[PDB]
Amino acid sequence: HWGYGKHNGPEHWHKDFPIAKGERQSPVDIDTHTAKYDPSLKPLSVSYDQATSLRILNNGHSFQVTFDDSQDKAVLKGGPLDGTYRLLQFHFHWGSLDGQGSEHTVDKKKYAAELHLVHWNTKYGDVGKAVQQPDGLAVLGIFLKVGSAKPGLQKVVDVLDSIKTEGKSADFTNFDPRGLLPESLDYWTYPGSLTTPPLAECVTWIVLKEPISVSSEQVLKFRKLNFNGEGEPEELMVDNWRPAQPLKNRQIKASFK
Ligand SMILES: NCC(=O)N(CCc1ccc(S(N)(=O)=O)cc1)Cc1ccco1
Numbered sequence: 241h242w243g244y245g246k247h248n249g250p251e252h253w254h255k256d257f258p259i260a261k262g263e264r265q266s267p268v269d270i271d272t273h274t275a276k277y278d279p280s281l282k283p284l285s286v287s288y289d290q291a292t293s294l295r296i297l298n299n300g301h302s303f304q305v306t307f308d309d310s311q312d313k314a315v316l317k318g319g320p321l322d323g324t325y326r327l328l329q330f331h332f333h334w335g336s337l338d339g340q341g342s343e344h345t346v347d348k349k350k351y352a353a354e355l356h357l358v359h360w361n362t363k364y365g366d367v368g369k370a371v372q373q374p375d376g377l378a379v380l381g382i383f384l385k386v387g388s389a390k391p392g393l394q395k396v397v398d399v400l401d402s403i404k405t406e407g408k409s410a411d412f413t414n415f416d417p418r419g420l421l422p423e424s425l426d427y428w429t430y431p432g433s434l435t436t437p438p439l440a441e442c443v444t445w446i447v448l449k450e451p452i453s454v455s456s457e458q459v460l461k462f463r464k465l466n467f468n469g470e471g472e473p474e475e476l477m478v479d480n481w482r483p484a485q486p487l488k489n490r491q492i493k494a495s496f497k
């Protein structure tokens with residue numbers, strides 16, 4: 241029922257998911273002058289060399305690449321995190337125009353899109369258990385700006401015509417998510433939530449400061465996807481982002497000076 245339109249979009253979600261008005265909701269605006277450098281944070285450890293992608297799919301709110309998370313292959317550790325978090329999937333949020341599309345903002349600036357690499361804390365055994373814990377998930381967020389192409393994204397872009405509508409999926413093996421990462425792992429971190437229903441407050445957010453550049457042709461392909469399933473009125477999958485939510489009693493920490 242929920243979506244991103246006038247009658248079912250983010251301002252309506254609280255009726256079915258009252259935690260939408262909770263104390264640690266995401267995304268947020270990152271005020272760069274108020275985020276404090278935390279010298280106690282450790283460097284992130286992004287260990288993706290053994291990642292095993294499985295499928296790419298249109299779920300009616302984004303498109304997602306899924307990974308085999310039945311053992312410790314692709315893992316996120318360090319930074320603000322305690323323990324080992326396994327990569328489950330990545331997906332994107334994007335706009336109808338290059339100025340909008342990210343969920344997090346930086347000094348109120350919106351990027352054209354935002355990549356979310358979703359990981360779960362192995363101490364909880366499965367993702368369903370992890371989403372019920374305040375430290376169950378860690379999402380690595382990466383901003384996309386429009387400029388030069390990202391070569392490591394092209395394999396994704398070229399397969400989107402095969403998953404145009406909700407429900408569609410395709411084999412998507414041997415995709416290397418390291419090709420989506422910027423040079424720097426400098427980041428901001430804060431405790432938050434899933435940005436789509438059920439909006440569970442189970443996420444340690446790690447948002448990289450350095451955006452990746454993608455080309456206009458690449459993001460234009462994102463915007464040809466459909467929210468609807470095959471054989472329904474065509475509603476372009478654009479502006480599938482939740483706006484910034486109140487920071488409330490939280491501090492955003494920076495890994496860098
Ligand atoms: N298998 C369950 C599952 O994965 N869900 C979606 C997970 C989800 C992951 C990441 C983000 S995001 N955009 O914050 O990165 C938003 C939602 C549904 C759910 C959550 C809790 C219970 O059910």
Ligand SMILES: [Zn+2]
Pocket residue numbers: 331332333356435
């Ligand atoms: Zn997301």
